[PDB]
Each structure stands twice: as C-alpha cells, then as structure tokens.
Amino acid sequence: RENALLSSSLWVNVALAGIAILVFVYMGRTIRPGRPRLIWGATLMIPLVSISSYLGLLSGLTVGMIEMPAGHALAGEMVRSQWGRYLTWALSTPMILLALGLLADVDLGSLFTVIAADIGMCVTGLAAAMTTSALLFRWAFYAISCAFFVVVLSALVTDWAASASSAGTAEIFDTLRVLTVVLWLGYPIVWAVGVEGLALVQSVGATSWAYSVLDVFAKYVFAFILLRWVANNERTVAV
Amino acid sequence: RENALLSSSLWVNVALAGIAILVFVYMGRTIRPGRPRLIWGATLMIPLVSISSYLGLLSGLTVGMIEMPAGHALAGEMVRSQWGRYLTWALSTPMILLALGLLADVDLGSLFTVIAADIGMCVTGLAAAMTTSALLFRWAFYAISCAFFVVVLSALVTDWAASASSAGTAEIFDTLRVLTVVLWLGYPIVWAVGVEGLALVQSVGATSWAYSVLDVFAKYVFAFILLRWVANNERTVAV
Amino acid sequence: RENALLSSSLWVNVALAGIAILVFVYMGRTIRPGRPRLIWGATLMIPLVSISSYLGLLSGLTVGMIEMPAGHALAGEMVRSQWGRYLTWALSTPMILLALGLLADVDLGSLFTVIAADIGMCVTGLAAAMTTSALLFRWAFYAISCAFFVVVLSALVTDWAASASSAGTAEIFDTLRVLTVVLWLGYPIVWAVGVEGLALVQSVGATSWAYSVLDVFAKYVFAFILLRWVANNERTVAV
Numbered sequence A, B, C: 001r002e003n004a005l006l007s008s009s010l011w012v013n014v015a016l017a018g019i020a021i022l023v024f025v026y027m028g029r030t031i032r033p034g035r036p037r038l039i040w041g042a043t044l045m046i047p048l049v050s051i052s053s054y055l056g057l058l059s060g061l062t063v064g065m066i067e068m069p070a071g072h073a074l075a076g077e078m079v080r081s082q083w084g085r086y087l088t089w090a091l092s093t094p095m096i097l098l099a100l101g102l103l104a105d106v107d108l109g110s111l112f113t114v115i116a117a118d119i120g121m122c123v124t125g126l127a128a129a130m131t132t133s134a135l136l137f138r139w140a141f142y143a144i145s146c147a148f149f150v151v152v153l154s155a156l157v158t159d160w161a162a163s164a165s166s167a168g169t170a171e172i173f174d175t176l177r178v179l180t181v182v183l184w185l186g187y188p189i190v191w192a193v194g195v196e197g198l199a200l201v202q203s204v205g206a207t208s209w210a211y212s213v214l215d216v217f218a219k220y221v222f223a224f225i226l227l228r229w230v231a232n233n234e235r236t237v238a239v
C-alpha cells in the first residue's frame, strides 16, 4: 500500500522545480548577452524538462504496469514502471551536459560526442526497464548503458576539464563535475537495488523517492550553484 | 461530416511542399560551396520533413482517436488526434532554426541551446495533446510548452540578431525573424481555440486547415524568401 | 521455416560487435587527448549502438508482426518486421557521420545539417516499414527517405571532402567515404528486394543476414580502418 508515498515523491518535485525556475529567472535576468546568458537559459531548461517528466508520471501518460520475467525476484508479478523517468532523462541529461560544456567552453566536437554517448545511455536504460521476455536481456541493456555512462564520465573526468582550465572556469568546473559524477552514479545504484533490478527494495514508492532526491541535487542544486557562480563571474564567462 | 475537408487540407500541402522542393532545387543548384550551400540544404529539408508529416497523417500512421476528459468541452467524446503533426514539428522546427542560425552565423553553443529548447517545446506540446486522464495535465503541458517557446523567441528576438548584424545578414534576418515570430505564435492559438484546447472551433478539418495554412507560410514561403536572398547574396554569406 | 536462420544473423553480430569493442579499447587506449581521442570514442560507440540494436531484436522488444497491404506481393499475410533495426540506425548512423566529420574536421554547421538529413532518412525509412494502410504510402516514405539520403551523399561526395583536404586527412577520408557510400547504398537495395519492399526474396532470415553483413563492413570494418589510421597518425589529427 503506497499510492500516497509514490504520488508525494512526484508532486514534491513539481513544486521544487517550479520554485527553482522562479529563483533562476530572478537570478539571471540581468546577465550579460552571450555565453553567460546561454548558460542561464540551460539552467532554466533543466527544471522545465524535470517538471515535464513529473507531469508525465502524475498524469499516467508515461507509466504502465509490466510483468517481471522468470528468474527475477518478482517473476510473474506486475510492477509499476515509471518509464517516463528514463525517457525524459534523454532530454534533461543532455541539457546538464550542455550547461557544463558551455561552462568549460568545450569544442562542440567533444560536446556532440558526449551528448551522443549520453543519449545512448538513456535509450539503453529505457530498453532495460521495458524488456520483459527474459531477465538476461534486461541486464544486458543495463550493462551497455553503463558502457555509455563510462564514455560520459571519461569526458567529465578528463577532456572537459582541459577545456575549463583554458576558459578560466576550472574551479567552478571541478566542483560541478564532482557533484555530477557522484550524483549520477546514484541512478544506476537505485535502478539495481530497486524493483527494476535486484528488487532488494520492493517498494516503487521508495525507489521513486530515491530518484526524486537525486533529482533535487543533480538538477536543482546543481543548476543553482552553476547559475550563482556565472552571475557572479560573468566577465570571465563572456571572456 | 468532413472527411473531405480534413483530407484536402493534407493533400494540398503534399502538392505545395512537393512544388517548393522542385523550385528550391532549381533556385539553389548553382550556389557556391560552404555556408550558402548548407542553407540551401536546410531549405530543401524543411519541405521534405513537411511532406513526411502529411504522409503520416494521410496514411493513418500518425493519427488516432482520443477521448476528452471531464471538464473539457467535449468530455466523454472521441476526437480525431493528428498527433503526427506535433511529433514531426520536433524535426522540422529545428531545421527552420538551423537555417536561421546558419544565416545569422550563430555559435553552435547558442544554436544547440535554442534547438534543445525547441525540442522541449514540441515534446511537451505532443504530451499535452496525448494526455487524457485529466484536463489539468493537458493545460499544464501546454503551459510548459509555452515556457520553452519563450526561450526560443528570446533567442530570435535578441541573441541571434546580434550574430546576424556581425555576419552581414541583419536585414534579411530581421525580415525572417519577424515572419517566424508572427507565424509561430499562430500554432498555439490554433491549438487553444480548436478541439485540443477550448474547442471554440469543434471541426478537426477546420483546425487542420488552420495549421496547413500556417505551414505554407512558416515553411514554404519562409524558405523561398531565405533561399532567394542567399542565392542573390552568396558572397556575403560565404563571407 | 527459419527461426534459426534469423536468430543466428543476430547473435553473430552481438559477438562480432563485442569483439570489435574489445579490439578498439586495446587500439585506442594510448591515443593523445583531443580530436584523436574523440574519434576513438565515436569508434567505440558505433559497435555499442549496434549491440543495443541486436539485443532489441533478440529480446523481441523491437520486433512485431505486421500485415502487408493490398497490392503488395504478400498482401494479407503476416510478416515479421525488425523495426528495431530501422529505429536504431537513427542513433548509429549519426555516430558514423560524427566520426567522419571529426576526421574531416568539418564545421558543425555542416555536421549538424548532415546529421539532420540523416535522421530524416532514418525516421522516414521506419515510417515506410511501419505503414500498413496502403502500399502507396510505404513507397512514398521510401522515396522521401532516398531524398534525405541524397543530401547525406552530397555532403560526403563533396563538401566534407573539402574540409578533409584542409585538415590533412584527404587520403584516409577518400577511402572511408567511398566505403561508406558503397555500403550505405546496399541498405535500400536490401529493403526493396526483401519482404518490406518487392519481396523478390521472401525470407526475413535471409534479408536479416543481408543487413548483418552490411553492418559488419559499414560499422566494424569501417571503424577499425578509421581507428587504426588515427592511432597511426594522431599528430596530424590533433593538428
């Protein structure tokens, strides 16, 4: 029993994302034209994409019930699948990467390559959750998704940092890269521990809360820190 | 009664888009290599994406019947939903923005950010039309879509214009930006007045004609004006 | 009878793609930071996207049975449709184009325009295979797809080559462009000769083998040649 546990994890972020959007409009309204202003735009779009994700889940548009396959801890049982989360990450995670790439001033060759890997990660993660014929294919898609994640992590952890040191944004970039790497690693852990994976935690409402908490930090806190710094150091960024 | 009213609004643009494509091949065949030639390519792709959209609708591939929720003027009634229009805009509107960004010579940081917002606009607009559980979620998605539209409009209306003045294309860019802003504003008005929204107009054939007319100007006339100017001023653009 | 013929064409490439990935990690581990390293990343992602495609097909996630329309050689018969192939090309073909564009050092204006056309090609090809109301619309989508393909071919065949000569990569680019043009032309031929098109070949297992063979060369051999050359000429590429 937990329709309320599940629904509260969703409404709470519709409220938080909405508040973040207002706060960010306030914070960036006077930012100078150019690169600084572009990052402000990305910072606004991260919570807007997040609200779309939560509305898809609350409305029922992007949620369905799926039956787990033989071998799964819940084999032959119906599980609620919030596939709308996995689908929407294909738009919000590239926006986070866009914000970070604009900040580090990376060449779009690198930005395009990282967003491509990131989309591969999200598409294969969705496939992992939607696959029901055999347990093997669910984990095979999860593994491929991890492989795409490594490509993204390698870029944060290395190439992109090179670009930041040269744009005069190494310090803020180091803070945001570490926060991103740490929080992003939490999504596949939640997936593997919850109903979709090993089912060590069998509550979909609990797992939904785990993702909602990760979102608050990976998206809203992330974006506030980034936007506050850019507003306070706009000459460096336009430069 | 209006299978004919609806079907004619679709075939008419398959014919017009097809004619535009032939005219554009004729107009741009001799354009010099580089930036001018890239814009010619985008100008060809706008009507090609448009024809795909109309074929999805005419074939039935991207059309379904949906039932309106409690509170809607047509609550508990089946309505034809041309969701293929909303879906295909996710590919054609970025092409229009690409053509305008190549023209204004914007940095791809800005172009990527604007196309990202534009895709958010189109995806949330589709969600608005496909949502059926509650009337509230339909309008919530419509509002978020409007928010993404504002980000795109802000770019036309400001940042991009800066880039154009510096590329030597301010005049043609001012003409095309104004035409785009005006015509693009007509799509959410049609959506809100027609069956999907307030249903002040309850004919799906009429609303389909409203969109078809907007397409002729937003896509075909838009592209002809752009292509004619680039063919006539290719030195400025390659420069 | 041929569940085995069909399934072997899929498992064989899961194995080959997996081997390619290991070989490429080995080959590119020491490549210098920058452009060379980005191409290595794309070279890794081509086979990773390919494995996702084959897992979607083997699991049943991206396969369905469709009934052919009046006038088709198999009118009123159920045909297995591997639509997951067509869908996944929307991610793998842009990666191939990305690798080639990084190699030729093209401006992202051109790269974005070519990937846009390429996605149009893949989306309309999928529509061609998924359309079932009338035979006419299947071929109309196939023709539009061909039109988008011409835009991509024009870029390989011309604009991109200009960029390569200027990056010091003309020779390797000429080899890879020719291999790409030739192998890519084989996909629409297979589509038109097999069950989806004219049905001159009515075995879905045979047609699946035709695509699998094209994939080995268009993706794995392609990527090995590209990666071997970049590892051996990294100074030219970083330069």
Ligand SMILES: *C/C=C(C)/C=C/C=C(C)/C=C/C1=C(C)CCCC1(C)C
Pocket (backbone or CB within 6 Å): A086, A089, A092, A093, A121, A122, A124, A125, A126, A128, A141, A142, A143, A145, A146, A149, A184, A185, A187, A188, A191, A215, A218, A219
């Ligand atoms: C705003 C949301 C964010 C930052 C979401 C990030 C999500 C991921 C990094 C998901 C990663 C996953 C894997 C690496 C394995 C497959 C399971 C996933 C999709 C949860």
Ligand SMILES: *C/C=C(C)/C=C/C=C(C)/C=C/C1=C(C)CCCC1(C)C
Pocket (backbone or CB within 6 Å): B086, B089, B092, B093, B121, B122, B124, B125, B126, B128, B141, B142, B143, B145, B146, B149, B184, B185, B187, B188, B191, B215, B218, B219
């Ligand atoms: C070629 C077609 C074009 C130019 C289509 C443009 C469509 C829009 C600007 C749609 C905008 C909408 C909103 C801003 C609110 C939600 C309803 C939409 C999707 C119609």
Ligand SMILES: *C/C=C(C)/C=C/C=C(C)/C=C/C1=C(C)CCCC1(C)C
Pocket (backbone or CB within 6 Å): C086, C089, C092, C093, C121, C122, C124, C125, C126, C128, C141, C142, C143, C145, C146, C149, C184, C185, C187, C188, C191, C215, C218, C219
């Ligand atoms: C890795 C896979 C590759 C390189 C796939 C390439 C696929 C194409 C070039 C498909 C082309 C097609 C057309 C041009 C007409 C419609 C049928 C298609 C989609 C097979």
Ligand SMILES: CCCCCCCCCCCCCCCC(=O)O
Pocket (backbone or CB within 6 Å): A052, A053, A055, A056, A057, A062, A084, A087, A088, A090, A091, A094, A095, A098, A119, B112, B115, B116, B119, B123, B127
């Ligand atoms: C920043 C550029 C990213 C480009 C990403 C291209 C693919 C986007 C796909 C997004 C699917 C999102 C659908 C969301 C539906 C919902 O949120 O309710």
Ligand SMILES: CCCCCCCCCCCCCCCC(=O)O
Pocket (backbone or CB within 6 Å): B052, B053, B055, B056, B057, B062, B084, B087, B088, B090, B091, B094, B095, B098, B119, C112, C115, C116, C119, C123, C127
């Ligand atoms: C210019 C680059 C844009 C990138 C856009 C990425 C997401 C494209 C999604 C397009 C969906 C279109 C499906 C069309 C089907 C039809 O037209 O019948």
Ligand SMILES: CCCCCCCCCCCCCCCC(=O)O
Pocket (backbone or CB within 6 Å): A112, A115, A116, A119, A123, A127, C052, C053, C055, C056, C057, C062, C084, C087, C088, C090, C091, C094, C095, C098, C119
């Ligand atoms: C290199 C950038 C490309 C951008 C492409 C944007 C649109 C990608 C859509 C990919 C759909 C792939 C779904 C795959 C599912 C599967 O493989 O099982």
Ligand SMILES: [Cl-]
Pocket (backbone or CB within 6 Å): A049, A050, A053, A088, A089, A092
């Ligand atoms: Cl999201």
Ligand SMILES: [Cl-]
Pocket (backbone or CB within 6 Å): B049, B050, B053, B088, B089, B092
């Ligand atoms: Cl369109």
Ligand SMILES: [Cl-]
Pocket (backbone or CB within 6 Å): C049, C050, C053, C088, C089, C092
């Ligand atoms: Cl693929």
Ligand SMILES: [K+]
Pocket (backbone or CB within 6 Å): A060, A061, A062, A063, A064
């Ligand atoms: K649902």
Ligand SMILES: [K+]
Pocket (backbone or CB within 6 Å): B060, B061, B062, B063, B064
């Ligand atoms: K339909």
Ligand SMILES: [K+]
Pocket (backbone or CB within 6 Å): C060, C061, C062, C063, C064
């Ligand atoms: K299936």
